[PDB]
Design an enzyme around this catalytic site. Structure first.
Site, PDB file in Angstrom:
ATOM      1  N   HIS B 101       5.296  -3.048  -3.153  1.00  0.00           N
ATOM      2  CA  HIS B 101       5.096  -3.887  -4.347  1.00  0.00           C
ATOM      3  C   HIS B 101       6.185  -3.736  -5.335  1.00  0.00           C
ATOM      4  O   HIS B 101       6.035  -3.899  -6.549  1.00  0.00           O
ATOM      5  CB  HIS B 101       3.729  -3.621  -5.002  1.00  0.00           C
ATOM      6  CG  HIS B 101       2.559  -3.894  -4.083  1.00  0.00           C
ATOM      7  ND1 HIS B 101       1.731  -5.016  -4.199  1.00  0.00           N
ATOM      8  CD2 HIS B 101       1.944  -3.099  -3.093  1.00  0.00           C
ATOM      9  CE1 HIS B 101       0.728  -4.923  -3.289  1.00  0.00           C
ATOM     10  NE2 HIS B 101       0.897  -3.819  -2.591  1.00  0.00           N
ATOM     11  N   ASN B 174      -5.368  -6.928  -4.306  1.00  0.00           N
ATOM     12  CA  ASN B 174      -4.477  -7.877  -3.625  1.00  0.00           C
ATOM     13  C   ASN B 174      -5.088  -9.266  -3.630  1.00  0.00           C
ATOM     14  O   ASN B 174      -6.209  -9.430  -4.129  1.00  0.00           O
ATOM     15  CB  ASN B 174      -4.178  -7.445  -2.174  1.00  0.00           C
ATOM     16  CG  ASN B 174      -3.197  -6.328  -2.052  1.00  0.00           C
ATOM     17  OD1 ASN B 174      -2.487  -5.978  -2.942  1.00  0.00           O
ATOM     18  ND2 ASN B 174      -3.226  -5.713  -0.853  1.00  0.00           N
ATOM     19  N   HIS B 365      -3.005   2.853 -10.869  1.00  0.00           N
ATOM     20  CA  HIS B 365      -3.403   3.709  -9.769  1.00  0.00           C
ATOM     21  C   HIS B 365      -4.939   3.557  -9.675  1.00  0.00           C
ATOM     22  O   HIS B 365      -5.643   3.776 -10.686  1.00  0.00           O
ATOM     23  CB  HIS B 365      -2.930   5.134 -10.118  1.00  0.00           C
ATOM     24  CG  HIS B 365      -3.443   6.188  -9.131  1.00  0.00           C
ATOM     25  ND1 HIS B 365      -2.873   6.392  -7.850  1.00  0.00           N
ATOM     26  CD2 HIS B 365      -4.586   6.989  -9.184  1.00  0.00           C
ATOM     27  CE1 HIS B 365      -3.623   7.356  -7.186  1.00  0.00           C
ATOM     28  NE2 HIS B 365      -4.647   7.739  -8.041  1.00  0.00           N
TER      29      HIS B 365
END
Ligand code: HEM
Ligand code: HEM
Ligand code: HEM
EC number: 1.11.1.6
Lengths: 726, 726, 308, 83
Positions: B101, B174, B365
């Site tokens: 990414h 995603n 995260h």
């Protein structure tokens, strides 16, 4: 609540003498002590009281005692994000220490000049006696790591960051007026020679090993700063009681464009004072943090370290008028030839809050000058200008080290630099280049001028071919060591001889000792002979015939090079041990504490155990330490008041305490029946200069002790100490 | 002054449509937009206008055009500290890119829930419909570097940082509802297989190479997400027109301790829309920054990206009610079986000021959860929890990456962690450990509770032996790929086939293409045979006889899996190309522009050169771009008004413009003599669905066009495009 | 010709007692002492004698005494790439020290089992009495920096890297059989409490300060290893005269799959011996490198440290 | 040094010289070479001053800069000839 109900866990936020309260972060000890830089750090100070414990992401933690596991005797689970953040941060705590001066101690303060210096410099921080400049100062040794001891024999660093209104100026100096080497190319060679040897990484904090003396024997330009190192300058009592020097000749540039050469000096207002070697060496074992501690506790007591900035000024036209090169950093400028002009005063008056954040991460670099200063071609300064930026990006993790809070300017800074690791500033400028039209070319260059102008280098004329060559004018190595030698008192000379003798005795290859004694014979035959006798070496006839080097511009001595030849003692902030017994005579203790308080001298009450003792009148005396826990090494003088002397008369540690203090030339004062301790140190009934004695501790007794303390040590005792077994 | 006198260098600080002004840093473009996180960044925003150019130490620079040299044709001098600082900073600008990414585009915004969700979660940010939580969102591709192109075929990341009052929560998702692999241990193997091959570092931004499809052929768990990537899902039109998913099953935990399983969704309120492959591939060449540019220009125009957060909620007791394992991230939960409950709305309404400081340095995260959420044993999620903190300390230079301003919580954070590179916070706590008495144990742990409590993990039961074993429940690979395939429209299925056929044509080793056709034959025979035919491969009798996998819980399709089966078009923020001529009919242009304005559709006026053209009635028409300069790839439809059509009738670029748009299925509208262009795209005299045509551009000519735009593309054109040479 | 003509600058390459010769790099003092790990390092050992002085790019240097300047009293020029490479390398010499055990001293050696342990473990390095495993061992204190003193009162580390035929095994132990704390979550708290205190960074190499004893008084699980640290175990005479322990229970697994719990020990074949506190504290001043020195010179004398 | 992790980037295999290289530089991150020289400084006696400087010469000599004459004042100024 785990704090005691009495509040005794928290130190009073007022000035208190050493040992009276636990030490604390500066903003909590002295919350009313402010300056512009101290205030500017408020964005990043973090408190704690009344706040919940969280992860770094702000999530409250319920149980900080246990890892998450599958069953209470089960394996730890990878999903424990609270354990893994806490342990990752711990795992990444350390950063590289400084390549040199890794061991150091720092404090905040402020500076102001005595008068405007605008006739010789346009620097803004020297323009107005009522314009105060914050500073941050770090003092250091050179060779040892950040966990090495303080009272080693070494040079000390003295670095001051001035947060001026026209930029940061860092004056990055040492405590002796010259360095060991002439050209920066040799710095890694010299540092590698003095540092622990590369096969086994021994010795720490010491030049007393083969590779250092091998280098010295092969590079006579080192001898001048070696003489300073081997004298008691190498073992200061405190960072408050040493000189500071910039070493190099720099320039001052005034508004009309005139350049004046300058060397920078710091004069300690507490006076110059040093330990003796056996004391210094033993103190690296009994308290390897002695200087760090003494500095922090002097500022908590209000005994702020003060230093006077001074300049030696030489007109441009007098560049070549000396018998040494002004640009040679192994040569000093004698104050008998060029006096130090007083410029201003610096006071350190607050300790940091967090040593790592403020001291470890501070970055001082002598290329950080401001308009009104400039460099010269001194070839050691020239090469320094490359190294400080380069090493500080390695050590502090990238090119935004100026955004670490301690290093930030307090004045504006704007430019077109961008990115780099841990970038904090978010630039809103549409442009990141100039010239630009899209932001009407801001931020803009500023022409040079009298005040608030851009920097322009002084247009020195350069004429020469591209060479790697040492100036022939730098090729003289023995006259300045000789001038230093001849300027020391006899006891200071003896201590120099003893420092070279002790160090070269630790050199295992005897030929290196012999080569160093041959260099010493080119400086002074009396010095060389005295070192040779201690080494079992006999000078040859040729050595006995070496012609001494010439005087330095006619000088046979300069007493400003001595620590002690001119009295400059100040007892404020020194400390005495008071050896208690279990029935102290309260009248002695009153008289002693009153006279100490009048002169700002602190006391530590010692005994053979901790807790309390009660005096003859019922006064309960808390004990600061045992005789073994706070040895004489840690104080400047010793007082034994009367009382039940039989309690301590046969105590080995109390007797040794007097023998150690006696050997190390400290004043001792014995009241009443404490005079029975004269027998441990072999003092005749008639008494001895440096032992104060009377029937009781009164006005006269304390005045005599304080007069001895103002002279620092009892040099006249030296002949009497070789026979004491201590 | 370098800015022009008319001020045309500065973009208007108000909302403007794409192309109308130069783009600018978000706080300059939209100074009145605010939220709590944008406010908290103000302490590190740096301006520029009216400030002097300085070093980072605050020294003003006089000449930022020249190095210091000895003579104006002489060598550069080491004492030029201003050159060395500027060049050192430049030399250290780059930091490592993200391992995956690396290419991504981000913006600020805010989220609010529609109602309190306290009955199912104690998460504070979901507790009150009036509670506004700032967000920072980054969208990304997966495989390419930070300087790769945006409109590649790839999965897209959709990562949201919620700055809550009880901690940062990062929802790291995603744009497809599953991932390629089941266990984190295989992530380096799968990422190494899709990334550029290790000998020659080709290809960038592409899965169309041997190693990727080698892995896929040997790891049939990958086939589900591979189906999504080979569909038009792999080529979104905009980050504003794609779905987002957390993929994993997580838990919500309410105040009573009850756990509910949840999967996260984002629904694009602009609707679902993708490019077609030839258009996407060519657009990587014509504008590799197309999605970054479209996102930033939508926010500058006020076409704020909006998304609805939704939850699929499954009770703990329904864990095993499905034909697939809830913990398997290669399985989706069909919406037909478990609906998405709407939760709240997120709006992205401000661009960053500095891309590197805010976008490149942001760190998201999925282990960053808050009380009210918890994990599950999904074995891909489990291993993610180790990777994100580890990689972010590597990429961002140390363990204090939470102090980089974009990453900082807006809520309080206090703990006993200290030091580390780049440490900004200066802790004043006397203690750096707990339990402590010296600061009365602050900051203190907080027990769990219904609000503002400490984090406690849900006490899930664990039972089994320590094993490296995949759950047998995860060992089914073909049913969900088939459900996806059967849920697509016939034209979406054609584009899937063409995606596999094109990618396998670029695999040089033919057996790998054979092995991948064998896997397709286990999903669906029509799919397999159509790809085989394009590869010159014939299915064996055994392949023709593989039994299709079972339906998922009785479903033979779920239309929520298709981009287009259920129309959800929104034209606001789309763009039309208007092809000008040297005498445009102004009435046509007035009508076109007025109808486009009324639906919030932008326009770009194109010609054969820059400058202006003049309308029939004297109206001066400013040209935005040339035909070649802003190709049809960059717009949603093409309108050609009447006028002097002979001016552009033989212009190759103008004819090509329409043929490209035609090939890529875009609506095209032709007024008056612009109808002559029907010949270049071979349209019959009676017209065809998707080509709007009329004597003039109104009555209903603009409604017809805008209806075609609401349906995004003209799918019924597909059989006609193979004949067109474009 | 800077060396003495009598050759007295170079130590004899034979075992010699402490102080008799200058100490030297192992491969120069004992070239014939070999093991498979020491042999495998030959690819990166760099000599010096008879070689020209060069930059790191292999360019011979003619004058390593001076920077390049415009005139012999002129400014240094940016084109001096020899000076810049040499001072850049020097400027980046240091790396972060270990968070704990930063102060340590290490040596090479070898391990051999007395008999095959195949009945209780399939570890290849314990399978055959004739199988020799090279080792590298580092002994350490815990709290002080890399430049702190050796004979402090502290726990000592005793770490052994075994270079086996089936992988590296590191046995990372200390010189007492327990640790201060029970769960790793508390290790940053306990280490922060024993380390120099955060306002002032004092004291180095000592637990004798308020935060350590504050933590101990509030966490009685620490009292067992505190007892060991306050005993003369905290002040060993040498790394040769202390015990070692892995602390944790681990498992041995044999070929049949049976697990046996194990705790690991090292017994010093030179015996157990410690200093007394006034001696250890004084010795930190008179020779802060005493344990590093003693280990190095024991090896140079042939008094090889041996442990069972 | 920033991009390749420290000052021993010349030890990364593609960057290594194929000719000899020997000097007194030590340490740094990821130091590969294990120096056996007793000395890490020069001048030294304890290794007979090796490795040694080499005078410049027609082949295999040390590097010496061409002795260009420099004459001018310290200025931040562009040559007029470049305008
Ligand atoms: C007159 C001679 C010198 C004086 C007075 C001097 C003084 C100092 C002082 C006081 C410090 C420590 C500043 C602090 O407290 O952080 C220091 C650090 C340093 N010095 Fe110098 N030094 C001299 C020569 C040199 C030379 C010739 C070089 C290399 C060309 C050099 C390179 C360094 C390096 C690399 C550091 C570590 C700086 C850091 O990591 O922030 N020094 N020096
Ligand atoms: C459901 C599967 C996954 C999803 C949805 C996912 C999503 C993401 C996204 C959106 C980012 C970019 C965040 C940003 O914009 O900065 C990212 C970064 C990353 N991912 Fe994941 N990922 C998944 C699986 C994994 C796995 C299994 C691993 C390793 C075990 C992993 C390791 C990383 C790494 C190392 C980064 C770079 C993070 C940084 O440097 O800050 N990902 N992932
Ligand atoms: C039985 C308890 C423990 C023993 C015997 C022990 C032993 C050691 C030893 C001997 C070293 C030095 C290895 C060397 O010479 O390089 C070391 C280093 C270290 N220890 Fe442990 N340790 C213990 C517990 C812990 C715990 C609980 C943690 C963290 C959760 C920890 C973290 C570390 C770290 C971070 C290092 C530095 C490693 C390096 O930089 O290479 N230790 N320990």
């Amino acid at each position: 609540s785990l704090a005691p109900e009495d509040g005794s866990h928290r130190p009073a936020a007022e000035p208190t003498p050493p040992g009276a309260q636990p030490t604390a972060p500066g903003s909590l000890k002295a919350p009313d002590t402010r300056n512009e830089k101290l205030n500017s750090l408020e964005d990043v100070r973090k408190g704690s009281e009344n706040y919940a414990l969280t992860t770094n992401q702000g999530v409250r933690i319920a149980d900080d005692q246990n890892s998450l596991r599958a069953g209470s005797r089960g394996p730890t689970l990878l999903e424990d994000f609270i354990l893994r953040e806490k342990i990752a941060h711990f795992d990444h705590e350390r950063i590289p220490e400084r390549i040199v001066h890794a061991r150091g101690s720092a404090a905040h303060g402020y500076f102001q000049p005595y008068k405007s210096l605008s006739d010789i410099t346009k620097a803004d921080f020297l323009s107005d006696p009522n314009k105060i400049t914050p500073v941050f100062v770090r003092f250091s040794t050179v060779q040892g790591g950040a966990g090495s001891a303080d009272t080693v024999r070494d040079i000390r660093g003295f670095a001051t960051k001035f947060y001026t209104e026209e930029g940061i100026f860092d004056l990055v100096g040492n405590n002796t007026p010259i360095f060991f080497i002439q050209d920066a190319h040799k710095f890694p060679d010299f540092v590698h020679a003095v540092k622990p040897e590369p096969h086994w990484a021994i010795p720490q904090g010491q030049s007393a090993h083969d590779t250092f003396w091998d280098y010295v024997s092969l590079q006579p330009e080192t001898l001048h700063n070696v003489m300073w190192a081997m004298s008691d300058r190498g073992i200061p009592r405190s960072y408050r009681t040493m000189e500071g020097f910039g070493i190099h000749t720099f320039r001052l540039i005034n508004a009309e464009g005139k350049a004046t050469f300058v060397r920078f000096h710091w004069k300690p207002l507490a006076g110059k004072a040093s330990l003796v070697w056996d004391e210094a060496q033993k103190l690296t074992g009994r308290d390897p943090d002695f200087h760090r501690r003494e500095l922090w506790e002097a500022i908590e007591a209000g005994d702020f370290p003060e230093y006077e900035l001074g300049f030696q000024l030489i007109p441009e036209e007098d560049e070549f008028k000396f018998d040494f090169d002004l640009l040679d950093p192994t040569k000093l400028i004698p104050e008998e030839l060029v006096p130090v002009q007083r410029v201003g005063k610096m006071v350190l008056n607050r300790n940091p809050d967090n040593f790592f954040a403020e001291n470890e991460q501070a970055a001082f670099h002598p290329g950080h000058i401001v308009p009104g200063l400039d460099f010269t071609n001194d070839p050691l300064l020239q090469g320094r200008l490359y190294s400080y930026t380069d090493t500080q990006i390695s050590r502090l993790g990238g090119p935004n080290f100026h955004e670490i809070p301690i290093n930030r300017p307090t004045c504006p800074y704007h430019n077109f630099q961008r990115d780099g690791m841990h970038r904090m500033g978010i630039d809103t400028n549409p442009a990141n280049y100039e010239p630009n039209s899209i932001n009407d070319n801001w931020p803009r260059e500023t022409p040079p001028g009298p005040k608030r102008g851009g920097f322009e280098s002084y247009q020195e004329r350069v004429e020469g071919n591209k060479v790697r060559e040492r100036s022939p004018s730098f090729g003289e190595y023995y006259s300045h060591p000789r001038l230093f030698w001849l300027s020391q008192t006899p006891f200071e000379q003896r201590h120099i001889v003893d420092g070279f003798s002790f160090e070269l005795s630790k050199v295992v290859r005897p030929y290196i000792r012999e080569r160093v004694v041959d260099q010493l014979a080119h400086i002074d035959l009396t010095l060389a002979q005295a070192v040779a006798k201690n080494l079992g070496i006999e000078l040859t006839d040729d050595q006995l015939n070496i012609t001494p080097p010439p005087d330095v511009n006619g000088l046979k001595k300069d007493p400003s090079l001595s620590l002690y030849a001119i009295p400059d003692g100040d007892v404020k902030g020194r400390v005495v041990a008071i050896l208690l017994n279990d029935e102290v005579r309260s009248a002695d203790l009153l008289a002693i504490l009153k006279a100490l308080k009048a002169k700002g001298v602190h006391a530590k009450l010692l005994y053979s155990r901790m807790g309390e003792v009660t005096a003859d009148d019922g006064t309960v005396l808390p004990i600061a330490a045992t005789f073994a826990g706070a040895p004489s090494l840690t104080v400047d003088a010793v007082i034994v008041p009367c009382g039940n002397i039989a309690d301590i008369a046969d105590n080995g540690d109390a007797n040794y305490y007097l023998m150690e203090a006696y050997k190390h030339l400290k004043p001792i004062a014995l009241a009443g029946d404490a005079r029975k301790f004269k027998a441990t140190i072999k003092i005749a009934d008639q008494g001895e200069e440096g032992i104060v004695e009377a029937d009781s501790a009164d006005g006269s007794f304390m005045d005599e002790l304080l007069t001895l303390m103002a002279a620092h040590r009892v040099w006249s005792r030296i002949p009497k100490i070789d026979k004491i077994p201590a």
